[PDB]
Design a protein around this ligand. Structure first.
Ligand SMILES: [Ca+2]
Ligand SMILES: [Ca+2]
Length: 312
């Protein structure tokens, strides 16, 4: 498979478990630090990074009834400038730029206890597709589906329902939505880390997925596998392959990667494009750091880059 080795430029450093890179509607940049702990207990953080200096500010260190969060993945909303944050202990959070937050769900739409979440992806209709590789949220004892198949997938809909849409994954992790050229959502892609698979579904409607398929094969037999992912503007899927030293690039039809991107580190964890550019910000777990490099084309626009009251 062809490999490229673009220059990686350092962005910031010393962020335990550096994850969930995201841009807001004003172009500010945020990362999560899921692995910060206090006295050995979770005390994860959500940070704003000043891109010009690399300096970090902790805007939110979420805790609910004394249980600290493990914030792990982010999306920006469209109608309000607020972050949706998948948290391995707290489920789904909505975080304001002032650092305040709310916990969205202790239970799902069927009354089952919510599971801790890892990453999420908004479709253009505003529905939020979420991976949940942890067991039940706090106050339940922390568990995660690295060995056993209890990871789930949710869709948090525009009408505020937290709907479990699949179960029995071994650590569902990154997630992405493919859209038709006209904007209609039509495929959901889910990483299952240790099995070295990417799974697809047909999106038939809000919270309606069917036709589950093994869509993509992640190289290697290292511990790790597919972590975070995003589409470029041509619908190529870029996937951090934690433990492989590469980001994989899948074409529109999946299968094997058509290209790999070598990183100067072993454990890329997640990635995000800067709007209106070819620049991909990459988090990684070897150095607990953030980098950037130039891809071949711009990113696929995120939901927060679309317009509610647009004409075209
Ligand atoms: Ca992840
Ligand atoms: Ca991303």
């Amino acid at each position: 498979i062809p490999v490229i080795e673009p220059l990686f430029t350092k962005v910031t450093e010393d962020i335990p478990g550096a994850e969930g890179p995201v841009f807001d509607k004003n172009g500010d940049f945020y990362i999560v630090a899921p692995e910060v702990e206090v006295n050995g207990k979770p005390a994860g953080e959500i940070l704003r990074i000043d891109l010009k200096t690399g300096k970090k500010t902790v805007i939110c260190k979420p805790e609910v009834n004394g249980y600290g969060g493990i914030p792990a993945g982010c999306q920006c909303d469209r109608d309000a400038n607020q972050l949706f944050v998948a948290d391995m202990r707290l489920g789904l959070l909505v975080v304001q730029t002032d650092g305040t937050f709310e916990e969205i769900a202790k239970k799902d739409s069927e009354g089952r206890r919510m599971q801790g979440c890892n990453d999420c992806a908004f479709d253009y209709e505003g529905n939020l597709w979420i991976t949940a590789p942890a067991g039940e949220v706090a106050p339940a004892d922390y568990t995660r589906s690295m060995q056993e198949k209890f990871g789930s997938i949710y869709c948090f809909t525009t009408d505020g329902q937290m709907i479990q849409v699949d179960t029995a994954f071994q650590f569902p992790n990154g997630i992405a939505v493919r859209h038709m050229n006209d904007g209609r959502p039509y495929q959901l892609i889910v990483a299952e880390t240790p099995t070295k698979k990417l799974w697809s579904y047909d999106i038939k409607g809000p919270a309606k997925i069917e036709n589950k398929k093994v869509w993509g094969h992640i190289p290697g037999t290292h511990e790790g596998g597919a972590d975070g992912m995003d589409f470029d503007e041509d619908n190529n899927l870029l996937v951090a392959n934690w433990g492989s030293s590469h980001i994989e690039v899948f074409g529109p039809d999946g299968g094997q990667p058509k290209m790999r991107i070598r990183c100067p580190f072993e454990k890329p964890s997640n990635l995000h494009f800067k709007p209106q550019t070819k620049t991909i910000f990459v988090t990684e777990a070897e150095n607990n750091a953030v980098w950037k490099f130039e891809w071949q084309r711009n990113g696929k626009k995120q939901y927060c880059e679309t317009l509610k009251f647009g004409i075209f």
